[PDB]
Design a protein around this ligand. Sequence first.
Ligand SMILES: *Cc1cc2c(cc1C)N[C@]1([C@H](CC=O)c3ccccc3)C(=O)NC(=O)N=C1N2C[C@H](O)[C@H](O)[C@H](O)COP(=O)(O)OP(=O)(O)OC[C@H]1O[C@@H](n2cnc3c(N)ncnc32)[C@H](O)[C@@H]1O
Ligand SMILES: *Cc1cc2c(cc1C)N[C@]1([C@H](CC=O)c3ccccc3)C(=O)NC(=O)N=C1N2C[C@H](O)[C@H](O)[C@H](O)COP(=O)(O)OP(=O)(O)OC[C@H]1O[C@@H](n2cnc3c(N)ncnc32)[C@H](O)[C@@H]1O
Ligand code: C15
Ligand code: C15
Ligand code: XCG
Ligand code: XCG
Lengths: 494, 499
Amino acid sequence: NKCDVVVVGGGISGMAAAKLLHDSGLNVVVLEARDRVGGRTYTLRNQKVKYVDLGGSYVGPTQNRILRLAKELGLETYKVNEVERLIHHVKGKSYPFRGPFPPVWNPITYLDHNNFWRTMDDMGREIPSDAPWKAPLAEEWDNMTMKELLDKLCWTESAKQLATLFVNLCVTAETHEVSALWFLWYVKQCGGTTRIISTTNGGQERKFVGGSGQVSERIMDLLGDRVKLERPVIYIDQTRENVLVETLNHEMYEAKYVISAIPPTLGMKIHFNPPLPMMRNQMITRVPLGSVIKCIVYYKEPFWRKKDYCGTMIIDGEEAPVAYTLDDTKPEGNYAAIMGFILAHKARKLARLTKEERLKKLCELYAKVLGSLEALEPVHYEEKNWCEEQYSGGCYTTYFPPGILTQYGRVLRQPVDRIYFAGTETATHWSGYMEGAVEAGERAAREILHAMGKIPEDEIWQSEPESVDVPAQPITTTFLERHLPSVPGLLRLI
Amino acid sequence: NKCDVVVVGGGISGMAAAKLLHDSGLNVVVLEARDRVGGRTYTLRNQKVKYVDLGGSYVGPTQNRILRLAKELGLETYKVNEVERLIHHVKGKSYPFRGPFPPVWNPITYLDHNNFWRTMDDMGREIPSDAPWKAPLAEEWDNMTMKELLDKLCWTESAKQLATLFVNLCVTAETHEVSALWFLWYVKQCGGTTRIISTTNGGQERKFVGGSGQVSERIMDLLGDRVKLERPVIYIDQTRENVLVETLNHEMYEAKYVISAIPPTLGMKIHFNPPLPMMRNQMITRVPLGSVIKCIVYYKEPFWRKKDYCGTMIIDGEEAPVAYTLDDTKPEGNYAAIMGFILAHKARKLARLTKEERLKKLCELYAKVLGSLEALEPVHYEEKNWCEEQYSGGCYTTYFPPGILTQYGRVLRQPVDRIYFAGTETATHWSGYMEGAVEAGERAAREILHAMGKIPEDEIWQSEPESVDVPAQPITTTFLERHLPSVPGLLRLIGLTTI
Ligand SMILES: *Cc1cc2c(cc1C)N[C@]1([C@H](CC=O)c3ccccc3)C(=O)NC(=O)N=C1N2C[C@H](O)[C@H](O)[C@H](O)COP(=O)(O)OP(=O)(O)OC[C@H]1O[C@@H](n2cnc3c(N)ncnc32)[C@H](O)[C@@H]1O
Ligand SMILES: *Cc1cc2c(cc1C)N[C@]1([C@H](CC=O)c3ccccc3)C(=O)NC(=O)N=C1N2C[C@H](O)[C@H](O)[C@H](O)COP(=O)(O)OP(=O)(O)OC[C@H]1O[C@@H](n2cnc3c(N)ncnc32)[C@H](O)[C@@H]1O
Ligand SMILES: CCCCCCCCCCCC[N+](C)(C)CCCS(=O)(=O)O
Ligand SMILES: CCCCCCCCCCCC[N+](C)(C)CCCS(=O)(=O)O
Ligand SMILES: c1ccc2oc(-c3ncc[nH]3)cc2c1
Ligand SMILES: c1ccc2oc(-c3ncc[nH]3)cc2c1
């Protein structure tokens, strides 16, 4: 089976790469392991839900590539509900609020919370988006976990508990599991603490009407039989004139170049001839993905709105199975629902239960947090545990344990002879997201066009015009936010 | 191709498992990815060296399973040279010594060093060998790195520097890369700090005459054509009555049971039907192996012995490419040589050089440490960087980063339907070593014999008689070693007295 380029993986990144090469007139083939496209996106349809995203779902301002590609494919977005108040549930009680962060009243606690977010952003400003290993303190920050950084920075338990929730929600991993350098890079490359965590004007702003799975599905529609489902790649041989790619179902493909568009560690499922260079050989064993169950509970009405709650809950404490929720009701106001994530160690702990047992735990939690018996009467339930997936390895994305990013980070996007590397993990802006999958797929495709003499080197990386539909507003701070002292700062001054 | 049991992997563990099963009367096949058996053991033979171990090589007292297996195969051991003095090189200078650790004269520094080793072993005694996640403080210890633990325990930089060399040499990883719970388990399950690090009476005491690769080679000889070389396994299907195992070169094997005798993360190279359970699916992405280049420099004579140095060097400092060496001269006294390890980040950093460039840096280092110009006159050089191996992933063994051993540790040797797990990583005594490979291969084989109804349950785990050729001396302490205070203990005493 001969072609110009074989793309390994039919997620957003693989599809985005294959579309760009196809549009330029090359013959492309996509080899997809699953019986479906979309990868870490997956939209389920049935009569009870109409459609529901069980994988990645949210898009927001500054994510211009995914918004442009989806629009071209005929998709529209709608705004996640944030009309009414958010809730922070702390020590068994609900506190309603508005804004990026829940209010803090104790003056010492206030200084400590303010300093924490401000310091994460100050640190990020020294970390290059395209080369975090070049931060002036790269080794110092990479050799400690986020747990150790929080222990140093947070003088109050209140700030440490909220910081921990923040880490667990952003990267589906425990603070002690991940490098401080890598985590600080991850926040900075999504535009900072406010942008990453916000609904209005942030990464949770919007969802696609009909589901995000439609991105990969609609590219597969364009490409037709160029997409081969149930073709897990098992072997890549670069010792001859053309590259040879073999699948598990005993097919052989021959191409001038390959794009690897799978999570980095899933490169281990492929046997290489000749062997990979030593730094990549070891890198792909050092880069796990996080752990999460995404759970959606359906109700007759969006009853929380009647109490002036929008459906967003930030829920602290070990006993709560879900630490974060958003309203998942359709833009038409029907199929009322709450989406929640079971994060990191809780995904491992609660996976032992039945689906019915998890539904009961969630409904009882939401009844307490929303202060409503209506939460105890679900009409339907859907969930997906991404820890189970052989061809994802987890969700949302790959995290770096201490020491790995500085030692192996340079390897991620370095070509290996005629194999180029896409996948959201290789992006420089919203890596981890659907936005990063588009950036990395289109960049890896343009590296091949450049290697073919079709475009100049300065066209490999390309800027994206801002979406007219989803424009970004500036992120601002107040004089007091910028200048109030930290807790040890107020002590040095006393 | 039909059989009772397919063993995936022909290193020591898979070879020990296959031998046990074969001896019990079962039909076994070994599917080995490489064109050779032995895996993380590899004995090179050529005219310049005669033979030389480029992978695992040392055995010692308390490693009774590997000693028994090797003896039965007709192999002999000899003692690594420790006749003359050891050297500790720190801050640019060499200090000769004898004993498990260089002597410390400053009384405050002495308290801190004594307390450090003592405390590592005290903590280890809280950790069950067969279940480290059951330690009372397992979560607390697993949620910090070894670097954080050294920062807390060591009240002198001298102790922290030495402990850092200790961690790097024991597990070919950095202190900040590894879980404190996992590292404390690893040391305890090798018999403790003295036993793991010693030559005489420890893990470095002996080598096999002719090389350790003979263990795997001689078992292949016993098994004949049951060992299939250049058969990398790509696919295991358990949806039917018999297990189906497919190889890369397009062959199919059918068996009642399978033993996976490969490093845990190399399980990712196999596509599973049905998919693995979620805990194992994630576990095999969380367990990297360490990084090392093993380097042997050959000389006309063992010239260091004439200066009353045995060849053992503990070398501190970033600029030193090699942090630990042993005399590698043949027991006959010829093919004089120094073996050195390039460890952890230095294996990555120095892999960029040529073989000739690395030889030059090693000779220049040895010349300074030994105060000997003769070190600049090598006659031959061999090396192996284990980081480059597709079918090993690194050496010596698998390490666990913070948080992993408590969350996923119980999965490591849990059977998946009809797949059982061997490999040194699943051992409970000298896991990471050739000893642990034998323990795990024989244990997994006996799990299958029990599943077939051939042996009762209490025979799955079996004790090993002590070697009569290499018996173990106990590790002892003195009254003062046991009861002298730590540095903060002493400060507490001072505070109390002066109150
Ligand atoms: C799973 C999951 C993902 C995301 C979210 C939630 C879940 C449960 N959430 C999103 C955000 C992540 C933040 O960090 C988010 C969370 C919370 C609030 C706001 C936002 C989300 O809502 N928005 C968003 O943009 N991204 C989210 N999540 C991550 C994205 O889903 C993810 O970034 C992209 O989908 C990744 O795309 P790709 O890089 O294209 O990678 P895959 O989807 O994994 O595709 C790889 C395909 O390759 C196939 N494969 C594997 N191995 C193969 C072999 N050997 N041979 C052939 N094919 C192979 C595999 O099957 C895939 O199809
Ligand atoms: C590499 C290396 C290993 C060891 C040492 C040094 C090096 C450079 N040193 C040893 C000590 C380790 C201490 O922690 C030590 C160090 C310093 C001072 C004293 C002692 C040593 O000297 N003694 C010792 O006992 N062990 C050492 N090292 C570790 C051992 O080499 C290792 O423990 C065993 O060899 C492991 O045996 P196995 O569990 O059987 O595992 P492998 O050897 O890796 O065999 C697996 C085989 O599987 C094949 N494979 C892989 N993937 C396959 C697929 N998909 N299909 C089929 N076959 C597959 C692979 O090719 C292997 O042959
Ligand atoms: C004359 C009185 C002097 C008292 C000295 C006050 C020091 C008290 C220690 C409290 C530790 C608080 N945390 C946040 C855990 C560590 C801070 C990290 S760091 O100290 O900035 O490194
Ligand atoms: C007479 C008492 C006065 C003491 C007051 C001085 C403060 C001492 C701080 C030194 C830190 C030493 N290290 C080893 C880095 C950390 C130890 C961790 S732990 O404190 O033992 O938990
Ligand atoms: C810690 C953990 C979760 C969090 O969610 C927010 C938030 N959501 C929408 C506006 N701010 C802020 C926040 C902080
Ligand atoms: C830290 C690093 C390496 C080391 O080697 C020893 C040792 N070797 C032989 C007897 N003791 C002790 C020791 C401590």
